[PDB]
């Protein structure tokens, strides 16, 4: 059951302005670690993480996603009166009410037909949205989709340093505070449309996804606390991406050298590290920019697919594996032709 009819006719991401460097971070986390004991440097030398980007100081979620909506439109050659959905991926969300997508919808200006909700799945919705999208243009529902995602980390970071300023954190809760500390702001849009509207853009397949739901409890997140079994995370993350690379051989003929580029979501370097080297890849085939831009989340796939494009790096016909391992646990794997 893949896609036949499923093609991607634009893409866009934008970087946030402001670049927050881990040196000025280790500067507010020094005490801490000094009464803790420790004198090694765990976001520049072992997450890998040197700096990540900030919005300005009140925007929104929605104001990012708009924005790459925007130029993802442009890229696509079409005005908003031809999206026909809009499904929001993001973590950041404004509100409870109304959605994400109903206010990126209304900045947009979408006409009364346009179909808007948001999805959640951690680091992996922004495919399952392409996925949902895929069904009503192939069913033929519509001819055009927009899948937005725009992430904000800002209160993430002045919440967590805040709370180093105390005395009393501990070295598990300061361990977790630390993985917050790898998070990033960015956004990305995909315009996605019924292959006959966009000929020669590249095609979307759709994909596999297999989870491990038995592993919810390995963490928990707030913007209140985070909790995180990092050993087990790792542990039953690889197994998990293993049974899921089986399916995706079956179903999408995944091989070592079918493929032309992996578009991963990436958790920290030390982590992307072992991931290749479990699976064989060839690490010059795994864009990153975890180092300067962090995690950013479901919006890191696209992000990093918008930025293999901008670079030319991709051409006609190459095969490209989107993936990610997500909290839950879940893994989804899917291809795109360029």
Excluded at 17 to 44: A, C, F, M, W
Excluded at 81 to 108: C, F, H, M, Q
Excluded at 174 to 184: D, I, P, S, Y
Aim: proline letters at 3%.
């Amino acid at each position: 059951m893949l896609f036949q009819n499923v093609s991607i006719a634009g893409l866009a991401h934008v970087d946030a302005p402001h670049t927050l460097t881990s040196k000025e971070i280790n500067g507010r986390l020094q005490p801490t670690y000094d009464r803790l004991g420790i004198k090694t440097d765990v976001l520049g030398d072992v997450a890998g993480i040197h700096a990540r980007r900030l919005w300005d100081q009140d925007v929104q979620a929605s104001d990012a996603a708009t924005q790459a909506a925007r130029k993802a439109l442009i890229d696509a050659g079409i005005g908003i009166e031809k999206i026909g959905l809009l499904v929001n991926t993001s973590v950041s969300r404004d509100y409870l009410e109304p959605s994400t997508a109903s206010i990126v919808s209304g900045n947009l200006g979408v006409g009364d037909h346009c179909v808007t909700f948001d999805v959640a799945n951690a680091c992996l919705a922004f495919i399952n949205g392409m996925d949902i999208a895929a069904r009503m243009l192939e069913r033929g529902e519509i001819d055009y989709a927009l899948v937005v995602d725009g992430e904000t980390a800002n209160l993430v970071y002045e919440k967590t340093l805040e709370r180093m300023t105390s005395p009393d954190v501990t070295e598990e809760e300061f361990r977790n505070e630390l993985a917050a500390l790898t998070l990033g702001c960015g956004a990305a849009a995909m315009v996605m449309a019924r292959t006959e509207l966009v000929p020669d853009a590249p095609r979307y397949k759709g994909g596999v996804t297999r989870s491990a739901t038995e592993w919810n409890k390995l963490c928990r997140g707030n913007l209140d606390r985070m909790v995180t079994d990092t050993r087990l995370l790792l542990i039953e993350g690889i197994k998990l991406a293993q049974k899921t690379f089986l399916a995706a051989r079956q179903v999408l003929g995944w091989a070592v050298d079918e493929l032309d580029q992996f578009v991963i979501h990436q958790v920290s370097r030390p982590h992307t590290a072992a991931f290749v080297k479990s699976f064989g890849i060839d690490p010059a085939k795994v864009m990153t920019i975890f180092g300067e831009h962090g995690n950013i989340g479901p919006a890191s796939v696209p992000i990093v697919l918008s930025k293999l494009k901008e670079l030319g790096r991709l051409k006609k016909g190459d095969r490209i594996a989107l993936l990610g391992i997500g909290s839950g646990l879940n893994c989804s794997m899917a291809e795109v032709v360029w």
